[PDB]
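Sample 1 of the test manifest.
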Amino acid sequence: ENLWVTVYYGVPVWKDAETTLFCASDAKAYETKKHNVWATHCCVPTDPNPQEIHLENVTEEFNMWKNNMVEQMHTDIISLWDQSLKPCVKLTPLCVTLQCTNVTNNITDDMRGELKNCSFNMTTELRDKKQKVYSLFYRLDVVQINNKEYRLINCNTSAITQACPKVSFEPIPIHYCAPAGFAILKCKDKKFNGTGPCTNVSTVQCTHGIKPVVSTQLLLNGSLAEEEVIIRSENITNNAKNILVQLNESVQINCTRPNNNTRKSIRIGPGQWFYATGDIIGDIRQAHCNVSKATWNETLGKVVKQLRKHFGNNTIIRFANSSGGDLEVTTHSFNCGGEFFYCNTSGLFNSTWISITLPCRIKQIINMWQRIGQAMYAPPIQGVIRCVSNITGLILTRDGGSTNSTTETFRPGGGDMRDNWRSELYKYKVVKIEPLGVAPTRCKR
Amino acid sequence: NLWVTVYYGVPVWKDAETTLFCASTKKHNVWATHCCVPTDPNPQEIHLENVTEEFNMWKNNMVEQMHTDIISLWDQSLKPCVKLTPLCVTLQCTNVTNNITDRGELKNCSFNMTTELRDKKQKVYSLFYRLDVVQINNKEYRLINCNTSAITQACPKVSFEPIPIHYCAPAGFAILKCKDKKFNGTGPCTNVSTVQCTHGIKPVVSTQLLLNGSLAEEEVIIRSENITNNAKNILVQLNESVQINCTRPNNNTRKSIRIGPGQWFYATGDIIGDIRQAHCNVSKATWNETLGKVVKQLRKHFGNNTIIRFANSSGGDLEVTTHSFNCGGEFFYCNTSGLFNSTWISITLPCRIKQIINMWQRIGQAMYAPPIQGVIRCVSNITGLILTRDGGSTNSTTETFRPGGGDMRDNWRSELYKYKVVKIEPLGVAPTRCKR
Amino acid sequence: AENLWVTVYYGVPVWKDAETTLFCASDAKAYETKKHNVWATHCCVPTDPNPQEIHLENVTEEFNMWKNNMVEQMHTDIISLWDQSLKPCVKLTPLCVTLQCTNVTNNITDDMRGELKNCSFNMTTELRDKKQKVYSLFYRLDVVQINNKEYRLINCNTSAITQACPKVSFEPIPIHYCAPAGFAILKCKDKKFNGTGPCTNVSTVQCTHGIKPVVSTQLLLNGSLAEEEVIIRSENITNNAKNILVQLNESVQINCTRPNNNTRKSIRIGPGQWFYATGDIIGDIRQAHCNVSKATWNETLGKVVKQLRKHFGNNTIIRFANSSGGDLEVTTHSFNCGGEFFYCNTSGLFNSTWISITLPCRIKQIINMWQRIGQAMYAPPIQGVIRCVSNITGLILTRDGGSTNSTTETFRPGGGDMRDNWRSELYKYKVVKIEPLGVAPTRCKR
Amino acid sequence: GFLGAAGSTMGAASMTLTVQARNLLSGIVQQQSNCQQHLLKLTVWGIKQLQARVLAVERYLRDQQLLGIWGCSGKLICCTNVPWNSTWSNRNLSEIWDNMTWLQWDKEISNYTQIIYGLLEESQNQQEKNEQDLLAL
Amino acid sequence: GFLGAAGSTMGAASMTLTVQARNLLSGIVQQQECQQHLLKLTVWGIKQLQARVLAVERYLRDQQLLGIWGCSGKLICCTNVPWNSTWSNRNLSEIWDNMTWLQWDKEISNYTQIIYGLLEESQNQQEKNEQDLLAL
Amino acid sequence: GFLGAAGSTMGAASMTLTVQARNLLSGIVQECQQHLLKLTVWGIKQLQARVLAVERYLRDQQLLGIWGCSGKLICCTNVPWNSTWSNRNLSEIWDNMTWLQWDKEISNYTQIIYGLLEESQNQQEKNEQDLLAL
Ligand SMILES: *[C@@H]1O[C@H](CO)[C@@H](O[C@@H]2O[C@H](CO)[C@@H](O[C@@H]3O[C@H](CO[C@H]4O[C@H](CO)[C@@H](O)[C@H](O)[C@@H]4O)[C@@H](O)[C@H](O[C@H]4O[C@H](CO)[C@@H](O)[C@H](O)[C@@H]4O[C@H]4O[C@H](CO)[C@@H](O)[C@H](O)[C@@H]4O)[C@@H]3O)[C@H](O)[C@H]2NC(C)=O)[C@H](O)[C@H]1NC(C)=O
Ligand SMILES: *[C@@H]1O[C@H](CO)[C@@H](O[C@@H]2O[C@H](CO)[C@@H](O[C@@H]3O[C@H](CO[C@H]4O[C@H](CO)[C@@H](O)[C@H](O)[C@@H]4O)[C@@H](O)[C@H](O[C@H]4O[C@H](CO)[C@@H](O)[C@H](O)[C@@H]4O[C@H]4O[C@H](CO)[C@@H](O)[C@H](O)[C@@H]4O)[C@@H]3O)[C@H](O)[C@H]2NC(C)=O)[C@H](O)[C@H]1NC(C)=O
Ligand SMILES: *[C@@H]1O[C@H](CO)[C@@H](O[C@@H]2O[C@H](CO)[C@@H](O)[C@H](O)[C@H]2NC(C)=O)[C@H](O)[C@H]1NC(C)=O
Ligand SMILES: *[C@@H]1O[C@H](CO)[C@@H](O[C@@H]2O[C@H](CO)[C@@H](O)[C@H](O)[C@H]2NC(C)=O)[C@H](O)[C@H]1NC(C)=O
Ligand SMILES: *[C@@H]1O[C@H](CO)[C@@H](O[C@@H]2O[C@H](CO)[C@@H](O)[C@H](O)[C@H]2NC(C)=O)[C@H](O)[C@H]1NC(C)=O
Ligand SMILES: *[C@@H]1O[C@H](CO)[C@@H](O)[C@H](O)[C@H]1NC(C)=O
Ligand SMILES: *[C@@H]1O[C@H](CO)[C@@H](O)[C@H](O)[C@H]1NC(C)=O
Ligand SMILES: *[C@@H]1O[C@H](CO)[C@@H](O)[C@H](O)[C@H]1NC(C)=O
Ligand SMILES: *[C@@H]1O[C@H](CO)[C@@H](O)[C@H](O)[C@H]1NC(C)=O
Ligand SMILES: *[C@@H]1O[C@H](CO)[C@@H](O)[C@H](O)[C@H]1NC(C)=O
Ligand SMILES: *[C@@H]1O[C@H](CO)[C@@H](O)[C@H](O)[C@H]1NC(C)=O
């Protein structure tokens, strides 16, 4: 009968929680150039020394598939993106009948029909005057009316706006930081599965810097973990779930657009300009990406070796290319140099287990796959562009309804943007600090 | 001898004005969408024994908030939808003379409207009600609001069907409810129960005759700010509902015309079958009895031997001269003169339909109500009347009353009359027998 | 312990330099009447009818008007209110059309030849398939020739123009800046305070004196007047790259007018969208102008120079000269009177070398209000005629430091950066924050 | 039962002081159902609700500060050394704690409230100073 | 070393109570250009205010409870409510030298409301009794 | 007379502690109101100002709580002076000096002193908990 309730305040315990995290940057992104979406948003620098605290003996359960931080990042990016277009020029006046031809001059056969030379009647700065102008368009954005009359692809569905010519969408790394009263716990287990208990937990103020890189099928410029290739999925057994594969070595991919572009500016209203693609200088060649087979064949062999752990050591593992659907799903959607590429990856998934040039299409009117109903027009970039990126992971799915268990088929798939962030945020969890608690002691008032 | 003691948590309140919040398959219902913070489904009413408190419904700021919130929600619901500016063109109209159960109520108008392309046009046609079409300078017509305001299209998914809403106090505040029988909106009362939220109130919009409200307990209650002053409205709450059956008998179809990139306009298409008059049926015996009860109670305030006459409405626009009724998604303007034509000591009311609505929240903006396919049938409860005295006469022998209203706040005052908002002031001081 | 322990005090009267958010307070009576004034409808906290001031005995406080964050606060608030006043009104994009015009030649004095143009154009009506031909008058500064009789509005290639709201007043009304709880404003009362350094008569207030948000360049109008002498303030004095703000201890009265009797017409351009055009002038057409008493102005500069010499030498020649090149908004005396914009030529005021003056004025309707570039406002015309009476309370001058020697200094009108018009009123105030905790030794122990 | 004691004897109502005090700061008991992200779009309603919440906090703190200054921090039924002045209510003790409720009582006091608060503040200032010197011995 | 504990026994963890207490409020004021830019993001700004207002409300809620229970101003508070063997049938060495607070909470979370109600009742009685004894 | 004691000596100024203490929560008491809800930016800036004023107030109250001075304007401790913080006698500290001057004199030791006060209070509570066990 001698034990009494003692109330304590400042007890080091926590509970799972969902809150709003704020973004932070390295300062330098804003200090130097600004004029980009993430430097402008992330106005608060991180601490120069965001030292983590190791928690001795702490075991905590993580679940990357239910991680609220991922859902927030998705929402924040879309909102940021929209607010970056809001102030710029609407391109409504371009939704007219166009008079187009085949370009023809200096085209390698692989590029025949890819570009069109279109003339049209657009307004000038004065309401009562018009001008006849012309520009090049990529075939993918131009749809035939009814053989010379064409419409822009967005005219019957969506509003179209011009992306701001001075704003970069470069994926500058950002950090998510907790508000007071909250903490971010992270798993330091090098082989963490994506779910379940982790016995190596530290507490941080901010996450590591994450580059908000947008792509589909092949994940670019992320983490390579540390020791081994890890295959993780919400279910594994259920083929309907995406499998996120994290590589332990990167594969370098070299992408280019070889055509030397120029640009012309057309005045379309008081204070407004339209950026049009001008004539190509020199030869017209196809855009493409190079993957070295020397590394790619070994990389897939490693994936298969690990993949077998869930499927059988005598099972046939087949890689195959994508299924049908929009280019955002069926090809490697890739945003680089300020232009949008849609690269054909079938040359990468053509093997059965027990240099590679990928041609690429270029598109300017983009229904950014965040939603349908608002199209973005990407202004052209002068000169030529080159990108060198690190492939750090893959998103694969399985074919259900297989004839038998002897053979499993893996294809590039997914493309939902959440999985491009889930793969970096998989090790972080947000918890709320709860300072009150009680315990029996031997003291009485 | 006695010492000052300071108390905290004293159950004492003062009159106060604060901001209340609205708590509330219908994913496109306005009331459902913007008021989504459900409370405990079992409100806890506290009876306060030995408590007397003063109410004044005419100075009740809960009414002003309901009014402002409704306007704001209304405007937000129309905020993201297509403007109909491209329809304000010269129209070329005919008289729609096929199968008219005899006329001139509808017009069939053709016009030049753009397509999705800036450089192409299409010839389209649609039906309009005469009330929304005004002649230029005999074939050429304009929409009625072209020289005043932008007309926007109502979002053709969105419903305004009233869902009872509840106004709830923030912490630190409480709502007092007067349950006294025969409470006439002003003065002290003694039931005073304490609630967290009001009863559910349907934000029903109407003029002249109030629909779907409460029924005054067991007697007809006549409420007024002054009674004597003929510039004031009289709100009469009935002890029985009067049933009214309304219809729009014409079988409509609908056209959808591309008006711009990503945008569609909803036009009224051809009528299938006979073209007939919209109307409302008020039970005739019930209405006769209802007025007799009102007259009995009304008479005691003017003289026990005086005569009461009812007469129909006076001047002003349709919004005040007719019974403004919003049901089935359409706007009816019913002629009530057949209800107020008698001297004391089924009734079919024809109704007009209008599509471009200067909803009286304000002037300068208008909503286009898209047409509804098929036919409409509405059944509703008349729960009260708004009357005015036809003053200026000196012949005290007979008082004359006419339908009035049009100021939307009166429709809210009639439900919120029993509620008052107070703030809690927890500190107080009293003497005691000790000192620290 | 040597018998001393740390005692903690809360409520200690100590303050530190701070930057915070201030709020806009008002008279609240002139404001009831002036229902459409931009700074009245948006400045609602009533001031205390009897404002308090507490003199602080034995307090020396260091002030610096050139680093005063209240200036940035006033600047951004004015810009914001300006933007929110125009936001709801009609865009005049539909008026950016080819205009056809000739010169107004009826009853023109010589000074007005070529100043007004009579332009007709094809404009929309409430129906999209109809057009109307209308005409209006324009000032030559608003209209640019298209390359013989064709013209466009000057803003047609750089920005859509918004019509100023016809009922909104921009009349300066006194504004009080007030601190939030936890903050205090320290006011410097020292006579002849030059903008920097310690001040020995310091008092604490909750709100500043009322400041009228008067916008002008070159000559500061309707400000505080100095009490003892002319005070010359500058961040550096020596550095020719900076402005000199001179506060007078006597006001100079200036009388400005726009003598032409104007009319106005309302043209419907769309569905409840109205444009206000300038119609024919009734009576003779004459040039707008301002009158400065010659003797008063001459004596006033005398006083300024006497003080200016303290920094340049008794044997140094001081010369005044007119403004340099640049846009009218920075080379002439711009100001807003009655809602119309004057750009007056002040060269007649600054032409002397030391050991009634009529200033012609131009009127412009398209205003690149300098809050920023890339936006424009159209000022509706004012019917009838106007007369302005105002007080010159200070000058914005610069030194001609291009190439010189000890023989002479030259001063000429400058400015154009509106923040200096506010430094001239806010120089006496500093914002500090209160920090109630502190500790001190004492003989007492628990 | 938040105002349940409103109709009760002043001395009886002293037993519900924690009920009224607790609900002045209801906490974070109101729940957010999923919508919510929707309600954030109603900019005006967003601002009005924040104003309501901020004010409730400020009112709470102001009352707590006064109890702090008067030396009644942490107490609901705290007495002090300011004597009762009979002009404030010319009735005996037995006519206060009974035969009346807390409503009514505040009307009896009325404008004397400001006077009482000033007295309480100065008294505490003197009490703290006296303790500060006692601790010097 | 904010969560420097939770990997130590309940007893050892009592030495870090001040560190945990000071995470709120100090960690908020401490937050301290384009911060002006962000004021143009209406939804974002509202969400941030809601987070700050909520953090304050949570802080005050807990302080009010300490007030009600008579533990105001303390990090460690002894009370007059006895411990029930059914809430947890464990001895002092057993919990103070082995459990880590996180574990403890998980095991007695079912009795949280019961205990809080008891703490309030004991304080209510104590305050009244003391006032009655003060008055001779 | 809110900062009226600013030129008074530290000793004399101890008599106005409630004048300054009341400012933080009384000052905040500060057609219209509704019109300004349209100025979204002012809405946010003013709420930020009020929220911060509350956060700062509470931060200071939390410290007084932690140090064991809750509810007091003046409190004694068990933490001694080191004589390095200020090498002065009481007759030249409480008199012949104002609080503004004093704050500058010892501003370098503010964090040191606060840390010491915290540790002392924690030890004191620990020794009430065991004492109540006997
Ligand atoms: C995975 O990670 C890699 C590595 O970070 C990343 O690749 C890099 O992408 C960036 C952005 O696309 C590339 O940066 C551009 O490089 C070109 C070429 O410059 C060369 O010559 C200069 C000479 O001084 C060297 O310093 C430089 O290193 C190169 O050798 C520059 O021209 C680009 O500058 C423009 O953008 C800047 C953005 O801040 C502007 O500040 C600058 O003023 C330029 O904009 C203006 O001029 C343009 C004309 O050139 C015009 O089009 C614009 O509208 C505007 O007017 C820029 O610095 C970088 O070189 C890539 N690195 C490698 C090795 O290739 C991958 O993209 C990433 N993968 C994915 C999927 O995200
Ligand atoms: C005072 O209070 C009373 C109630 O106490 C209230 O009366 C009720 O009003 C509501 C709303 O107007 C009425 O609800 C509608 O009823 C019709 C009738 O349909 C009957 O027949 C069909 C046959 O197929 C049955 O399936 C049905 O169950 C009924 O027996 C429905 O048709 C209405 O639904 C349509 O509109 C909805 C709008 O959201 C759509 O979601 C729904 O899918 C339907 O739309 C389709 O049909 C339309 C044509 O009918 C067409 O235009 C659309 O494009 C689409 O194809 C709806 O359920 C309810 O019946 C009334 N009660 C009574 C007894 O009459 C009063 O209104 C209130 N007073 C005031 C002033 O508000
Ligand atoms: C659509 O526009 C055409 C072109 O203006 C209209 O046809 C003209 O009508 C006028 C009489 O008002 C005739 O004098 C012209 O000769 C006609 N032009 C042509 C090319 O036929 C037509 O009436 C308009 N239609 C509608 C429904 O408004
Ligand atoms: C119903 O309303 C009437 C007012 O219309 C209230 O009557 C007033 O009563 C007060 C005092 O009792 C008088 O000073 C007013 O002159 C009365 N006005 C009229 C018009 O008679 C009446 O009190 C209300 N009902 C109750 C029960 O009080
Ligand atoms: C500023 O300094 C002066 C001089 O030391 C202080 O003046 C003395 O104040 C005491 C107060 O008890 C009076 O009895 C003396 O007669 C004053 N002396 C003179 C010469 O006037 C003054 O109080 C100080 N200011 C403040 C705020 O403390
Ligand atoms: C490239 O274009 C030029 C004309 O600009 C033409 O003379 C030349 O033959 C073309 N080259 C090829 C490969 O078609
Ligand atoms: C890894 O995830 C799979 C999903 O099927 C699960 O069955 C397995 O138990 C998890 N492994 C670990 C160590 O958590
Ligand atoms: C390269 O591909 C062959 C099949 O063509 C395969 O047998 C071999 O193991 C692969 N190399 C590596 C390193 O995996
Ligand atoms: C009138 O009725 C006839 C059927 O006899 C029908 O064919 C015709 O379309 C109707 N006209 C209308 C709907 O006005
Ligand atoms: C058409 O309607 C007008 C207006 O009501 C009327 O004057 C005219 O006689 C009608 N004509 C026919 C043939 O219906
Ligand atoms: C009319 O004005 C133009 C431009 O100011 C000028 O060039 C022309 O000579 C004028 N014609 C006259 C003054 O007759």
